[PDB]
Amino acid sequence: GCVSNLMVCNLAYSGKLEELKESILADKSLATRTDQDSRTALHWACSAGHTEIVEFLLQLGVPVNDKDDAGWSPLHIAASAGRDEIVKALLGKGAQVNAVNQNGCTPLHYAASKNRHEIAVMLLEGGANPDAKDHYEATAMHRAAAKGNLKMIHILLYYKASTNIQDTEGNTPLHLACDEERVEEAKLLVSQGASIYIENKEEKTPLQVAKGGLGLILKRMVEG
């Protein structure tokens, strides 16, 4: 299907390398011409997962941080869509790991929520702020902990992600973890120094928000 009013962007998205090669080399100004979504071939190459095309456009020397008009950089797209090699290639040409789109989200926000284990690691190993806050002041931990992504919580914790940051509703990873009854996720957070005392904008603690025996198994883990 046609995704761009600009030939190069369509060649890039569909995987037409030899044609994009011949095309681009014939007019270098095409590598950076923007389309209706303010996207170059790089953006669409990142979206589809065409690594050889990304690489070619990077050898050429196109910018790697240029945002589309929703604020998505190449790294936002590669990360969100699960393209390990492209993410690697982009970090290899100094891609900004902490760029935020219009929704305030970083690449790591997307890697975290979609369980991009290898990429999360790649972003974090490449200078990602694990404590990056979107517009609701949520972090990767907030998401992973709510969703109950145990493997991702490990990754974030090892890269020194705070466990006691508060979203605008005043909740912490641990609050989400409890409210959604993610049992280990709540144990593991508490083990690593997620407090059971703090309160959200509803005067409530992780223990209260919590349900079941988990509610005070976090109390007989910290206390007694």
Q: Hey, what amino acid is at 40?
A: T
Which whole-number Å values give the CA distances from 183 to 141, 155, 221, in the listed order?
15, 18, 13
Cα separation, 6 vs 145, in Å, equals: 41
Specify burial of residue 12 (Cβ count, 10 A radius: 0-12, 13-18, 19+): buried
Closest CA to 190 of 208, 201, 178: 178
Cα(57)–Cα(74) distance, integer angstroms: 12
CA atoms within 13 A on the CB side of 160: 5
Q: Residues near 61 by Cβ (< 8 Å), separated by ≥ 6?
A: none
How far is C-alpha 21 from the geometric centre of its chain's CA atoms?
Answer: 31
Q: What DSSP line would sit under 30-64, residue for residue?
A: GTT---TTS--HHHHHHHHT-HHHHHHHHHHT--S
> Are the C-beta atoms of 15 and 49 separated by less than 8 Å?
no
Closest by CA to 43, choosing from 35, 169, 22, is 35
Angle at 90 between CA 87 and CA 94, to 5 degrees: 130
Residue of 68, 31, 80 lying closest to 53 (CA atoms): 31
Could you tell me the CA-to-CA distances from 148 to 49, 87, 131, 140, 196 in Å, in that order?
Answer: 27, 25, 18, 12, 18
Domain limits of the chain? Answer: 1-224
Query: Where are the alpha helices (H) located in 117-200, listed in sequence order?
Result: 117-125, 140-147, 150-158, 173-179, 183-191
Alpha carbons 136 and 142: distance in angstroms, whole number: 11
Q: What Å resolution does this PDB entry report?
A: 2.2
Contact 170, 199 (CB under 8 A): yes
Query: CB atoms < 10 A from the CB of 165, how many?
Result: 17
- Method for structure elucidation: X-ray
Give Cα 224 distance to the centre of its chain: 39
d(Cα 65, Cα 76) in Å, to the nearest integer? 10
Q: How far is residue 153's CA from residue 143's CA, in Å, rounded to a whole number?
A: 9
139-142-143 Cα angle (round to 5): 95
